[PDB]
Amino acid sequence: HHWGYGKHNGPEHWHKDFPIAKGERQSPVDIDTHTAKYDPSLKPLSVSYDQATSLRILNNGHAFNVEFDDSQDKAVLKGGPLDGTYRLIQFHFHWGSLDGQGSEHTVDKKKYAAELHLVHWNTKYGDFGKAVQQPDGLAVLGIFLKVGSAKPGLQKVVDVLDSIKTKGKSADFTNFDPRGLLPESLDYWTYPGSLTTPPLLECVTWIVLKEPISVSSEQVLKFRKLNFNGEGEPEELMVDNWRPAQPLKNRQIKASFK
Numbered sequence: 001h002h003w004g005y006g007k008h009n010g011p012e013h014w015h016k017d018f019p020i021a022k023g024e025r026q027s028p029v030d031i032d033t034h035t036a037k038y039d040p041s042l043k044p045l046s047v048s049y050d051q052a053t054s055l056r057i058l059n060n061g062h063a064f065n066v067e068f069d070d071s072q073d074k075a076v077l078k079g080g081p082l083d084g085t086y087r088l089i090q091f092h093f094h095w096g097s098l099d100g101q102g103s104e105h106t107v108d109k110k111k112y113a114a115e116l117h118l119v120h121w122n123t124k125y126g127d128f129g130k131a132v133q134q135p136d137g138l139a140v141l142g143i144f145l146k147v148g149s150a151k152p153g154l155q156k157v158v159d160v161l162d163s164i165k166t167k168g169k170s171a172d173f174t175n176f177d178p179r180g181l182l183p184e185s186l187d188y189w190t191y192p193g194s195l196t197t198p199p200l201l202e203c204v205t206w207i208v209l210k211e212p213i214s215v216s217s218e219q220v221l222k223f224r225k226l227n228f229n230g231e232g233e234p235e236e237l238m239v240d241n242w243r244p245a246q247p248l249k250n251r252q253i254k255a256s257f258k
Protein backbone atom coordinates (compact mmCIF):
# COMPACT_ATOMS: atom_id res chain seq x y z
CA HIS A 1 0.00 0.00 0.00
CA HIS A 2 1.14 3.52 -0.98
CA TRP A 3 1.57 4.89 2.56
CA GLY A 4 2.18 3.58 6.04
CA TYR A 5 4.89 3.50 8.69
CA GLY A 6 7.37 1.04 7.18
CA LYS A 7 10.88 1.52 5.89
CA HIS A 8 9.69 2.14 2.34
CA ASN A 9 6.36 3.94 2.71
CA GLY A 10 6.74 5.86 5.98
CA PRO A 11 6.39 9.56 6.76
CA GLU A 12 9.49 10.66 4.83
CA HIS A 13 7.86 9.33 1.64
CA TRP A 14 4.36 10.76 2.03
CA HIS A 15 5.15 14.04 0.24
CA LYS A 16 5.39 12.25 -3.11
CA ASP A 17 1.68 11.42 -3.21
CA PHE A 18 0.65 14.20 -0.77
CA PRO A 19 2.72 17.34 -1.44
CA ILE A 20 0.93 19.21 1.37
CA ALA A 21 3.15 17.09 3.62
CA LYS A 22 5.66 19.95 3.20
CA GLY A 23 3.01 22.63 3.77
CA GLU A 24 2.72 25.62 6.03
CA ARG A 25 0.59 24.17 8.86
CA GLN A 26 1.51 20.50 9.23
CA SER A 27 1.15 18.40 12.36
CA PRO A 28 2.35 17.15 14.74
CA VAL A 29 4.83 19.67 16.15
CA ASP A 30 7.16 19.97 19.08
CA ILE A 31 5.59 22.07 21.83
CA ASP A 32 8.35 24.29 23.18
CA THR A 33 6.82 25.12 26.55
CA HIS A 34 8.98 28.16 27.15
CA THR A 35 8.06 29.70 23.75
CA ALA A 36 4.32 28.99 23.93
CA LYS A 37 2.48 32.07 25.11
CA TYR A 38 -0.22 32.25 27.72
CA ASP A 39 -3.35 33.68 26.11
CA PRO A 40 -5.72 34.97 28.84
CA SER A 41 -8.45 35.41 26.21
CA LEU A 42 -8.66 31.63 25.73
CA LYS A 43 -11.79 30.17 27.32
CA PRO A 44 -11.94 26.93 29.34
CA LEU A 45 -12.60 23.89 27.20
CA SER A 46 -16.17 22.59 27.25
CA VAL A 47 -16.18 18.80 26.84
CA SER A 48 -19.83 17.62 26.77
CA TYR A 49 -19.71 13.82 26.39
CA ASP A 50 -22.62 12.78 28.64
CA GLN A 51 -24.81 11.63 25.71
CA ALA A 52 -22.01 10.07 23.65
CA THR A 53 -23.08 7.03 21.62
CA SER A 54 -20.17 4.80 20.64
CA LEU A 55 -20.99 2.29 17.91
CA ARG A 56 -18.06 0.30 16.63
CA ILE A 57 -14.31 -0.26 16.80
CA LEU A 58 -12.37 -0.72 13.55
CA ASN A 59 -8.80 -1.72 12.68
CA ASN A 60 -8.21 0.36 9.54
CA GLY A 61 -4.64 -0.84 8.93
CA HIS A 62 -3.04 2.29 10.45
CA ALA A 63 -4.65 2.45 13.92
CA PHE A 64 -7.94 1.45 15.51
CA ASN A 65 -10.88 3.90 15.57
CA VAL A 66 -13.68 3.90 18.13
CA GLU A 67 -16.53 5.46 16.17
CA PHE A 68 -19.49 7.47 17.49
CA ASP A 69 -22.93 8.44 16.23
CA ASP A 70 -22.31 11.97 14.93
CA SER A 71 -25.75 12.49 13.35
CA GLN A 72 -26.83 14.64 16.30
CA ASP A 73 -25.14 16.89 18.90
CA LYS A 74 -24.58 14.04 21.36
CA ALA A 75 -20.90 14.43 22.25
CA VAL A 76 -19.47 17.87 21.52
CA LEU A 77 -16.44 20.02 22.11
CA LYS A 78 -16.82 23.79 22.43
CA GLY A 79 -15.02 26.69 24.02
CA GLY A 80 -11.30 27.04 24.33
CA PRO A 81 -9.98 28.44 21.04
CA LEU A 82 -13.06 27.25 19.17
CA ASP A 83 -15.97 29.13 17.68
CA GLY A 84 -19.08 27.02 17.35
CA THR A 85 -19.80 23.39 18.07
CA TYR A 86 -17.67 20.41 17.08
CA ARG A 87 -19.10 16.89 17.14
CA LEU A 88 -17.15 13.82 18.24
CA ILE A 89 -16.81 11.35 15.36
CA GLN A 90 -14.09 8.95 16.54
CA PHE A 91 -11.03 8.50 18.69
CA HIS A 92 -7.83 6.61 18.01
CA PHE A 93 -4.28 6.32 19.30
CA HIS A 94 -0.71 6.40 18.05
CA TRP A 95 1.89 4.35 19.92
CA GLY A 96 5.41 3.01 19.92
CA SER A 97 7.27 -0.26 19.90
CA LEU A 98 8.96 0.88 23.15
CA ASP A 99 7.69 2.99 26.04
CA GLY A 100 10.07 5.79 25.14
CA GLN A 101 8.39 6.67 21.85
CA GLY A 102 4.93 6.67 20.30
CA SER A 103 3.46 10.13 20.63
CA GLU A 104 3.14 12.46 17.66
CA HIS A 105 3.36 15.76 19.50
CA THR A 106 6.36 16.17 21.75
CA VAL A 107 6.86 18.50 24.72
CA ASP A 108 10.30 20.11 24.83
CA LYS A 109 11.32 17.17 22.60
CA LYS A 110 9.98 14.58 25.09
CA LYS A 111 8.15 11.69 23.44
CA TYR A 112 5.39 9.91 25.32
CA ALA A 113 4.50 6.22 24.99
CA ALA A 114 1.33 7.00 23.05
CA GLU A 115 -1.10 9.76 22.12
CA LEU A 116 -4.91 9.73 22.06
CA HIS A 117 -6.73 11.79 19.41
CA LEU A 118 -10.43 12.61 19.96
CA VAL A 119 -11.58 13.87 16.58
CA HIS A 120 -14.43 16.39 16.23
CA TRP A 121 -15.88 18.23 13.23
CA ASN A 122 -17.44 21.69 12.97
CA THR A 123 -21.21 21.34 12.62
CA LYS A 124 -21.43 24.43 10.40
CA TYR A 125 -20.06 22.26 7.57
CA GLY A 126 -22.71 19.54 7.84
CA ASP A 127 -20.53 16.44 7.55
CA PHE A 128 -16.97 15.33 8.20
CA GLY A 129 -16.06 15.13 4.50
CA LYS A 130 -16.92 18.77 3.97
CA ALA A 131 -15.33 19.83 7.26
CA VAL A 132 -11.91 18.48 6.26
CA GLN A 133 -11.91 20.89 3.30
CA GLN A 134 -12.08 23.90 5.63
CA PRO A 135 -9.34 25.59 7.68
CA ASP A 136 -11.52 25.43 10.81
CA GLY A 137 -13.17 22.13 9.99
CA LEU A 138 -11.83 19.88 12.75
CA ALA A 139 -10.90 20.14 16.40
CA VAL A 140 -8.69 17.33 17.69
CA LEU A 141 -8.14 16.86 21.41
CA GLY A 142 -4.72 15.28 21.94
CA ILE A 143 -3.89 13.49 25.18
CA PHE A 144 -0.51 12.00 26.01
CA LEU A 145 -0.16 8.51 27.53
CA LYS A 146 2.67 7.54 29.89
CA VAL A 147 3.29 4.07 31.27
CA GLY A 148 2.62 3.64 34.99
CA SER A 149 -0.67 2.82 36.69
CA ALA A 150 -3.49 1.34 34.66
CA LYS A 151 -6.23 3.54 33.25
CA PRO A 152 -9.48 1.78 34.25
CA GLY A 153 -11.54 3.56 31.60
CA LEU A 154 -9.26 2.22 28.88
CA GLN A 155 -9.61 -1.46 29.75
CA LYS A 156 -12.82 -2.03 27.76
CA VAL A 157 -10.90 -0.88 24.68
CA VAL A 158 -7.90 -3.10 25.46
CA ASP A 159 -10.06 -6.15 25.93
CA VAL A 160 -11.77 -5.95 22.50
CA LEU A 161 -8.53 -5.63 20.51
CA ASP A 162 -8.18 -9.41 20.13
CA SER A 163 -11.34 -9.31 18.02
CA ILE A 164 -9.94 -6.71 15.60
CA LYS A 165 -6.38 -7.94 15.26
CA THR A 166 -6.05 -7.36 11.52
CA LYS A 167 -6.83 -4.67 8.98
CA GLY A 168 -10.49 -4.42 8.01
CA LYS A 169 -11.89 -6.13 11.10
CA SER A 170 -14.54 -4.35 13.14
CA ALA A 171 -16.57 -5.16 16.22
CA ASP A 172 -19.60 -3.72 17.93
CA PHE A 173 -18.51 -1.29 20.61
CA THR A 174 -21.53 0.33 22.24
CA ASN A 175 -21.93 2.16 25.54
CA PHE A 176 -18.29 3.24 25.86
CA ASP A 177 -17.78 6.45 27.84
CA PRO A 178 -14.88 8.54 26.49
CA ARG A 179 -14.87 10.68 29.65
CA GLY A 180 -12.94 7.81 31.24
CA LEU A 181 -9.94 8.64 29.04
CA LEU A 182 -9.52 12.27 30.19
CA PRO A 183 -6.96 13.52 32.70
CA GLU A 184 -7.99 15.59 35.71
CA SER A 185 -6.93 18.95 34.27
CA LEU A 186 -8.09 20.40 30.96
CA ASP A 187 -5.19 22.88 30.73
CA TYR A 188 -4.02 22.87 27.11
CA TRP A 189 -1.85 24.19 24.30
CA THR A 190 -3.43 25.05 20.96
CA TYR A 191 -2.22 25.77 17.43
CA PRO A 192 -3.50 25.48 13.83
CA GLY A 193 -2.40 22.29 12.05
CA SER A 194 -3.30 19.30 10.00
CA LEU A 195 -4.32 15.68 9.89
CA THR A 196 -1.29 13.59 10.82
CA THR A 197 -2.00 10.88 8.21
CA PRO A 198 -2.63 11.25 4.49
CA PRO A 199 -4.27 13.24 3.07
CA LEU A 200 -2.61 15.57 5.61
CA LEU A 201 -5.25 18.25 5.12
CA GLU A 202 -4.69 21.56 6.91
CA CYS A 203 -8.08 21.63 8.61
CA VAL A 204 -7.37 21.06 12.33
CA THR A 205 -7.43 23.24 15.42
CA TRP A 206 -5.19 21.20 17.69
CA ILE A 207 -5.91 21.22 21.42
CA VAL A 208 -3.20 19.26 23.28
CA LEU A 209 -3.70 18.66 27.01
CA LYS A 210 -0.77 19.36 29.28
CA GLU A 211 -1.55 16.52 31.74
CA PRO A 212 -0.88 12.99 30.45
CA ILE A 213 -2.94 10.01 31.43
CA SER A 214 -1.23 6.92 32.87
CA VAL A 215 -1.78 3.47 31.37
CA SER A 216 -0.20 0.21 32.46
CA SER A 217 2.56 -1.68 30.68
CA GLU A 218 0.04 -4.48 30.09
CA GLN A 219 -2.43 -2.08 28.44
CA VAL A 220 0.12 -0.72 25.99
CA LEU A 221 1.48 -4.21 25.31
CA LYS A 222 -2.00 -5.13 24.06
CA PHE A 223 -1.93 -2.23 21.60
CA ARG A 224 1.34 -3.66 20.24
CA LYS A 225 -0.26 -7.03 19.45
CA LEU A 226 -2.44 -5.52 16.77
CA ASN A 227 -1.48 -6.01 13.11
CA PHE A 228 -1.11 -3.57 10.22
CA ASN A 229 -1.78 -6.39 7.77
CA GLY A 230 -5.00 -8.11 6.82
CA GLU A 231 -5.86 -11.67 7.83
CA GLY A 232 -4.02 -14.19 5.71
CA GLU A 233 -1.18 -11.76 4.98
CA PRO A 234 2.27 -11.83 6.62
CA GLU A 235 2.12 -10.52 10.18
CA GLU A 236 3.48 -7.03 10.79
CA LEU A 237 2.88 -5.67 14.27
CA MET A 238 1.02 -2.36 14.51
CA VAL A 239 3.67 -0.34 16.32
CA ASP A 240 5.32 3.03 15.72
CA ASN A 241 2.28 4.37 13.88
CA TRP A 242 3.29 7.96 14.61
CA ARG A 243 4.37 10.82 12.38
CA PRO A 244 7.36 12.79 13.79
CA ALA A 245 7.28 16.48 14.60
CA GLN A 246 7.06 18.84 11.62
CA PRO A 247 8.39 22.39 11.28
CA LEU A 248 6.37 25.01 13.13
CA LYS A 249 6.91 27.64 10.40
CA ASN A 250 4.77 30.76 10.80
CA ARG A 251 2.69 29.57 13.75
CA GLN A 252 2.40 30.40 17.43
CA ILE A 253 1.43 27.87 20.07
CA LYS A 254 -0.81 29.37 22.74
CA ALA A 255 -1.26 28.09 26.29
CA SER A 256 -4.47 28.22 28.29
CA PHE A 257 -2.51 28.35 31.55
CA LYS A 258 0.37 30.15 33.20
Ligand SMILES: O=C1NS(=O)(=O)c2cc(-n3cc(CCO[C@H]4O[C@@H](CO)[C@@H](O)[C@H](O)[C@@H]4O)nn3)ccc21
Nearest residue numbers: 089090117119128129132138140195196197198199
Ligand atom coordinates in the same frame (compact mmCIF):
# COMPACT_ATOMS: atom_id res chain seq x y z
O1 LIG B 1 -4.64 12.04 10.35
C1 LIG B 1 -5.62 12.37 10.98
N1 LIG B 1 -5.66 13.29 12.15
S1 LIG B 1 -7.19 13.25 12.66
O2 LIG B 1 -7.18 12.72 14.01
O3 LIG B 1 -7.80 14.57 12.63
C2 LIG B 1 -8.07 12.24 11.60
C3 LIG B 1 -9.42 11.87 11.47
C4 LIG B 1 -9.80 11.00 10.40
N2 LIG B 1 -11.16 10.53 10.20
C5 LIG B 1 -11.67 10.16 9.01
C6 LIG B 1 -13.05 9.74 9.26
C7 LIG B 1 -14.09 9.24 8.21
C8 LIG B 1 -13.54 9.23 6.78
O4 LIG B 1 -12.97 10.53 6.42
C9 LIG B 1 -11.97 10.50 5.48
O5 LIG B 1 -12.57 10.39 4.12
C10 LIG B 1 -12.71 11.67 3.33
C11 LIG B 1 -13.73 12.50 4.00
O6 LIG B 1 -14.78 11.58 4.37
C12 LIG B 1 -11.31 12.31 3.21
O7 LIG B 1 -11.47 13.66 2.83
C13 LIG B 1 -10.48 12.21 4.47
O8 LIG B 1 -9.37 11.29 4.19
C14 LIG B 1 -11.09 11.69 5.65
O9 LIG B 1 -9.92 11.29 6.53
N3 LIG B 1 -13.22 9.88 10.60
N4 LIG B 1 -12.10 10.35 11.13
C15 LIG B 1 -8.84 10.54 9.45
C16 LIG B 1 -7.50 10.93 9.57
C17 LIG B 1 -7.13 11.77 10.62
Ligand SMILES: [Zn+2]
Nearest residue numbers: 001002003004
Ligand atom coordinates in the same frame (compact mmCIF):
# COMPACT_ATOMS: atom_id res chain seq x y z
ZN1 LIG C 1 -1.72 2.06 -0.07
Ligand SMILES: [Zn+2]
Nearest residue numbers: 092094117196
Ligand atom coordinates in the same frame (compact mmCIF):
# COMPACT_ATOMS: atom_id res chain seq x y z
ZN1 LIG D 1 -4.24 10.68 15.14
